[PDB]
């Protein structure tokens, strides 16, 4: 997703969120579109940025 704001805590507003994960039991990869999100920086492990 694209980032709207920053925090000291890396609380991040995100706009037009794609999110995607992996159900491993076999595997179904599930995706969800969430347009306006406010994400706490505690869960945030690694922010990678594409050019």
């Amino acid at each position: 997703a694209r980032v709207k704001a920053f925090d000291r805590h890396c609380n991040m507003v995100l706009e037009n969120v794609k999110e995607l994960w992996t159900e491993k039991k076999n595997v179904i990869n599930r995706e969800r579109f969430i347009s306006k999100l406010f994400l706490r920086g505690d869960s945030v492990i690694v922010v990678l940025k594409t050019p």
């Binding site: 709207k4 000291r8 805590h9 609380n11 706009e15 999100l37 406010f38 994400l39 505690d42 869960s43």
Partner: protein, 107 residues
Amino acid sequence: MKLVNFLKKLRNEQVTIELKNGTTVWGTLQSVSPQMNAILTDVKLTLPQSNGIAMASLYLTGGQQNIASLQYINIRGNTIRQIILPDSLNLDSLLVDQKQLNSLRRS
């Protein structure tokens, strides 16, 4: 610069909240605390497909009879993982931050 003030502009707004547990919560914000203890009236809350601790934490909150419909839930800040705002709301209005503006004029 903290963003809780952003949420403080959101009284009487209808969000969902996904928790660090995996609990999903639907219902309006009445307020929010300094360290993001968000109090929420008119909740119904759901647990997607499972986590046994989350199963207990869901059922035991009363009115389960797996959507649990509850009048009023305070939620602690370090439990709130992510919070989904309504898409009707304009982010260009809210992030302006009159405190940050005044601090720019304070400089």
